[PDB]
Design a protein around this ligand. Sequence first.
Ligand code: K0O
Ligand code: K0O
Ligand code: K0O
Ligand code: K0O
Ligand code: FES
Ligand code: FES
Ligand code: MG
Ligand code: MG
Lengths: 570, 570
Amino acid sequence: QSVTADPSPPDTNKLNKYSSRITEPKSQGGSQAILHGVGLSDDDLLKPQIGISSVWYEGNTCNMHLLKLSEAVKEGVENAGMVGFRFNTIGVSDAISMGTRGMCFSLQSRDLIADSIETVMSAQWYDGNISIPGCDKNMPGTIMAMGRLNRPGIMVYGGTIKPGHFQDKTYDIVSAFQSYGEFVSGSISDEQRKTVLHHSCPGAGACGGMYTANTMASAIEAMGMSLPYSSSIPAEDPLKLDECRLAGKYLLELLKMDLKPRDIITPKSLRNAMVSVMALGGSTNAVLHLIAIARSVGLELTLDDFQKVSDAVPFLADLKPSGKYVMEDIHKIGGTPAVLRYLLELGLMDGDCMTVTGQTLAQNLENVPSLTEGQEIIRPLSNPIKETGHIQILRGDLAPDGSVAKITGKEGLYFSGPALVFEGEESMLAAISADPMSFKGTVVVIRGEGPKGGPGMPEMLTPTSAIMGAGLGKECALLTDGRFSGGSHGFVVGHICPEAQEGGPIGLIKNGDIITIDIGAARIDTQVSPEEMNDRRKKWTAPAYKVNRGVLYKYIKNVQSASDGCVTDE
Amino acid sequence: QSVTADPSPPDTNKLNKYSSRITEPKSQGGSQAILHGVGLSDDDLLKPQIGISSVWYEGNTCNMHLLKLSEAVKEGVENAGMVGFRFNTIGVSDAISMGTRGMCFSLQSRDLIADSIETVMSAQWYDGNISIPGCDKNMPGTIMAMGRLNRPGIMVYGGTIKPGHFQDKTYDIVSAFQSYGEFVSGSISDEQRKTVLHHSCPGAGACGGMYTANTMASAIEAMGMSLPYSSSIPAEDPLKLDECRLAGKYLLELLKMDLKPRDIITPKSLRNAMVSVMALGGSTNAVLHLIAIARSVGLELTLDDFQKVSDAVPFLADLKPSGKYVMEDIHKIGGTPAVLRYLLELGLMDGDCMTVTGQTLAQNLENVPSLTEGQEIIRPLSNPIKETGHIQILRGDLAPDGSVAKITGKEGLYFSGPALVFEGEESMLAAISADPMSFKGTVVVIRGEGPKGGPGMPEMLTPTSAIMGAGLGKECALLTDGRFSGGSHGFVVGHICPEAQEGGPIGLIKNGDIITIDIGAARIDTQVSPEEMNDRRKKWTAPAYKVNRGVLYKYIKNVQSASDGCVTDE
Ligand SMILES: CC(C)=C1CC[C@]23CO[C@H](C2)[C@@](O)(C(=O)O)CC[C@@H]13
Ligand SMILES: CC(C)=C1CC[C@]23CO[C@H](C2)[C@@](O)(C(=O)O)CC[C@@H]13
Ligand SMILES: CC(C)=C1CC[C@]23CO[C@H](C2)[C@@](O)(C(=O)O)CC[C@@H]13
Ligand SMILES: CC(C)=C1CC[C@]23CO[C@H](C2)[C@@](O)(C(=O)O)CC[C@@H]13
Ligand code: FES
Ligand code: FES
Ligand SMILES: [Mg+2]
Ligand SMILES: [Mg+2]
């Protein structure tokens, strides 16, 4: 819990606790000369300095607008009497890289982003931070950096993309991904396929459903580290620019209070974040990212913590991918604060947690308009979509250190079938192409896709959509030490630990082993005896790492297990 | 030498070898929908995609102009028939962080930059790269990423800052750093001190002397990975913008030739780079960065390689800090190509190395105007400033795995003195404050500043300027496992390996040990017997790491020794 990462300030009530290190001593005249050179007056040197870290880049719709938002954040910082210094990190697009080896680089970019913002804040002695992520992994990456530094900070979510519309039909990135399967199946022509591709993503913003971006944005708001409505204002909405211009005012107040990320991110605000995930049907990736965020502030968060919140919180929101609505429809019925107000009224949330407004969650939500009368997106507690949360933690013989599944309650309580084992996604997809019926009734195992084996713990969508299009949805189960993206109508488990590369039982499974998934017992078991499994283990040798240089070899050297949130700095 | 880091392309003569992975298969319609959303037409999808990676940020003069350069690079990429996708990494300012704990974050940002550009190029499937660094570590960071990817790439140096001028007096960042010592000594008043600070850095650009930025920029041009004149055109010069607009034309040609970084960065172009360092009196940091660059392409480069080139190449350039002129004065006498033309004419360089112009170094230099008649910056081979290079590799008892020193030839051949040992820069500076005369005649050892002990292998300037201001310049020697920045008029050695944190002999030195530096034997020796040293070693226990989380704990876990270039991905 005693984190030692970044420099500590060189007194109370001082607003420039860190930048005074370089703006005040005569022995740092070199630093002051650079600062004059970038435009600071003598008066400016007395002011707090805010690092404004955006994740702009031009090759992704989620991120191409973030420089325009960064300009607005800087203008608000200046209007609040402080100095704004913009800088920008990298990010990668899951939508672009999905289905390719580029996806091996996606999860780790969260931790690269954390390292990047930490590096700049520490070296330049900035007093506070405003981050503008726009896309899946960007968000937890910025919060992790704020937790390590423990300097006042606010996350401004870039906002969600608007749905595409063409000829009385609604299209999104899900439409684009689905289009190829509908072409091969014969449902649509090549001409209809191309139309979907040209009208799926009309502008800037993150993916609209309850995928990782909106899950994490909502969760981070719920955790108190974004301003109210940050998660539900669309990316191109003029209110997003207004939020950007106001972050500086709110940050000034945080500096006056010295309200820091470790004052805001606590066991109870972490639970608030998890409640929001459960209630909205949020992504299983939130397990990885919330664990990493909790670790970044010196706290603990286990898989069991997620299971307890899941048991305690019903799934209430009729939102894609599980349901029919998108983040804009939440926005039109009162936004994320309206949802959280309802959950707080139900006693599911703790209102006493401090937030980046300088007030408590309860104080923020006191004044917010409630959910729109007659709305059908957020179900009553009396009529939930599921009595408990979607997220389910499975252990048992084959996942002794844990695993994560999204369970709707429609797949049944059990699946038993002979294992069909693949060393990588490629061999699985080839086998289901040549011989789809060989999959009927099996427990499909795609191993070697974990943090070290993948490497990079890639997300895989093609296995579930291939299973769906072969008519095998409820007829087989899918297990991996990596991650699955789309929903089957059957059992789909990821994050199996230990991963195959580490010699976990998943790497000892053989074709024909009878595997039994039991949701009530929360176990993925094998009919193979523990003694024969141990025999296989004694004979097992770890495969060679797939890379020997570069960022992914460093990831292999540094990354902890999926049950440990794949943190890299421990 | 067999590097496995990044994805390989999914045919010859194809110009979009990598982006075809996502622009051509119907199974990647999701990728194509994102690309349409960011503005690509169907015709645009057929074009090569260039990742344009700048290191812009607002808090440093070296980097604040790089977004404007990035816009020009993109416009040139489009004018050459390709698609330009801008993205931006982080960087840190050595001028701002020097003298503070922020400096522990500076060297590692080179390797963070390499990881960042590698990550984006791999995930987004870009065909080529144009990088726009502006500051010390940025430059080798971008080349390392290009070496790992081995996709056609060009480095555009951001260019050097113009000298500040006020009331018939020339000021630079060196003036600003010197100002405090001149205030404490009484040479100048507080009023004169403040004047230097306001007129030292008038605009955008890297430091003007032969510090790391200009050393590396020149070295990277000499290595063939920048266009001719990139290193010597000033940052605000309109020709820099013209260079930016032309990089796309040159990159198109590289894609047609499939001339890749591992075709350009070879043993012989690495030697060309080292020749340029020796001849210009370049920074000892170039030892670290050129080793890392050579490793990134699967090549070897040792400390002995530097000593052999140093022995073979005289110091010829009258350039700060060793001399009086700056990079702009090279620029006014024909620039870096004119210098390299002279060295090539002397037979010091290999002209057959391919470069990013698509032609050889000799072909580039055939047409360039020679050095301005009557110039006094570049000495003749008959009258060099030093018969061999400044860079000197020392081993011996106390640096068995090597060490690096800048030797002018003025300090003599020997120094012998009792050791005065400090565990960190702070205790050294306090001791020389309270008791300066206790330093007279000693060999000052500042240990625990290496890659893992510092951590971060920080650069330290205050020890040499404190020694200078106490009148002790030629009266003591300075040794460290970290790095020293400014020049003493005596012996100053850095990069001592193994570092103290790793239990190298430097961590076993005690106050009073007689240390003898012998330049001719190239040895740093101790009078203590090898048997007593081994006794000390058997009793020695490694100190606890100073951090336990964050980017610097990861650095500690990953970094190799200074003699190994402090690479992190092996
Ligand atoms: C960030 C780095 C490089 C550090 C090395 C060891 C210390 C230095 O002082 C200690 C620990 C610290 O608590 C402070 O007083 O500032 C924080 C900073 C770190
Ligand atoms: C399931 C399909 C159709 C997706 C559309 C684009 C994304 C949505 O969010 C992104 C990419 C994803 O990384 C997540 O957050 O889960 C994976 C899933 C796919
Ligand atoms: C970059 C990553 C994650 C890789 C994992 C193992 C391989 C895959 O194929 C091999 C090696 C490769 O030579 C290719 O044919 O493309 C390069 C890419 C890497
Ligand atoms: C020696 C003094 C006065 C310097 C002025 C600013 C810089 C120059 O270059 C930068 C910072 C440095 O990182 C290098 O490249 O060596 C260290 C040295 C100091
Ligand atoms: S790919 Fe960026 S939020 Fe979906
Ligand atoms: S600090 Fe950037 S080049 Fe000197
Ligand atoms: Mg994702
Ligand atoms: Mg430097």
